[PDB]
Amino acid sequence: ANECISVKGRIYSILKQIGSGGSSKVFQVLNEKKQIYAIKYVNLEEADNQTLDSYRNEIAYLNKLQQHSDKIIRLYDYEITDQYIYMVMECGNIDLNSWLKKKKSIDPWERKSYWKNMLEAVHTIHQHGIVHSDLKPANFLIVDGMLKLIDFGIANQMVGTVNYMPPEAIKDMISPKSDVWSLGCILYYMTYGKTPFQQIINQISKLHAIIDPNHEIEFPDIPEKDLQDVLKCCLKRDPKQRISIPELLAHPYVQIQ
Numbered sequence: 001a002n003e004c005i006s007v008k009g010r011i012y013s014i015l016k017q018i019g020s021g022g023s024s025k026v027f028q029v030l031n032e033k034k035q036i037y038a039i040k041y042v043n044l045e046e047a048d049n050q051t052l053d054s055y056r057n058e059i060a061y062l063n064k065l066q067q068h069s070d071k072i073i074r075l076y077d078y079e080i081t082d083q084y085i086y087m088v089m090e091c092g093n094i095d096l097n098s099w100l101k102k103k104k105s106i107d108p109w110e111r112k113s114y115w116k117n118m119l120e121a122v123h124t125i126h127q128h129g130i131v132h133s134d135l136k137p138a139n140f141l142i143v144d145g146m147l148k149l150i151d152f153g154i155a156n157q158m159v160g161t162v163n164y165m166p167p168e169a170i171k172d173m174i175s176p177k178s179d180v181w182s183l184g185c186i187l188y189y190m191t192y193g194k195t196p197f198q199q200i201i202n203q204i205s206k207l208h209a210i211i212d213p214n215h216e217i218e219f220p221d222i223p224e225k226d227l228q229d230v231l232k233c234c235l236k237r238d239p240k241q242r243i244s245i246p247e248l249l250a251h252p253y254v255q256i257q
Contacts, residue, residue, distance in 0.1 A: 005029060005039055007079045007086045012039060022158025028091060037076065038092070042085035054156035055085065061152050065128055071121035073141060073150045090143060095150075097137035100189065108224060111190050114140075115230075116254050117147035118183055123245045125152055126176045133174060135182035136164050137189070162203060163195040167211040167237045177239035180248070184234025191227060192220065196235060213237055226253040 019026030166181035
């Protein structure tokens with residue numbers, strides 16, 4: 001009825017469990033003053049040294065990079081022992097994926113503002129040598145009408161689509177341009193209500209379609225011609241010709257009005 005978690009002396013009462021994974025759980029919790037937080041619990045007892053290293057690495061980067069942008073989820077505190085990790089993080093409304101799934105269409109202004117947030121968080125991690133390499137909507141949390149990156153893709157291991165995967169990741173079987181493609185696929189989904197290769201149901205074919213230059217991606221004409229241009233720029237198969245994040249930050253789509 002009223003279970004608690006302690007983290008660095010501070011007791012937090014669990015309001016409800018909001019998420020889970022392979023031995024990882026996420027809780028909505030309230031502190032002594034009834035302030036809301038998300039606590040991510042990780043059980044470390046089967047984790048190997050390689051896995052542990054990646055976990056510490058992600059915690060370290062999350063801790064450092066949050067001072068550089070408020071579009072990165074706030075890590076308030078954490079307790080880490082040989083058995084468990086508890087992370088006290090800011091609480092949000094809902095992740096971008098869940099919100100997108102129950103949204104018939106997105107307001108053009110909300111879409112542009114979310115895009116800006118996404119570019120800002122991803123730009124920040126890039127400025128410190130991190131390429132996420134696995135961006136999807138689920139990696140972003142909506143907090144006070146603002147998108148926040150909740151992770152940096154460093155974690156080793158604990159569904160899962162290839163809809164957001166870039167062609168050079170598949171051919172090389174990887175740079176900051178790889179994240180631009182995936183962000184492109186998220187924006188495309190926010191624009192056209194599906195991702196560029198969603199219609200292909202065989203995953204092998206889908207992978208083949210992603211790397212095939214004779215497979216042309218559709219860009220149906222829309223009122224916002226700057227949005228359409230951004231999509232075409234992000235979804236160029238050649239990474240050298242693909243637009244960069246700083247180029248995207250100066251794009252009329254994010255700048256003009």
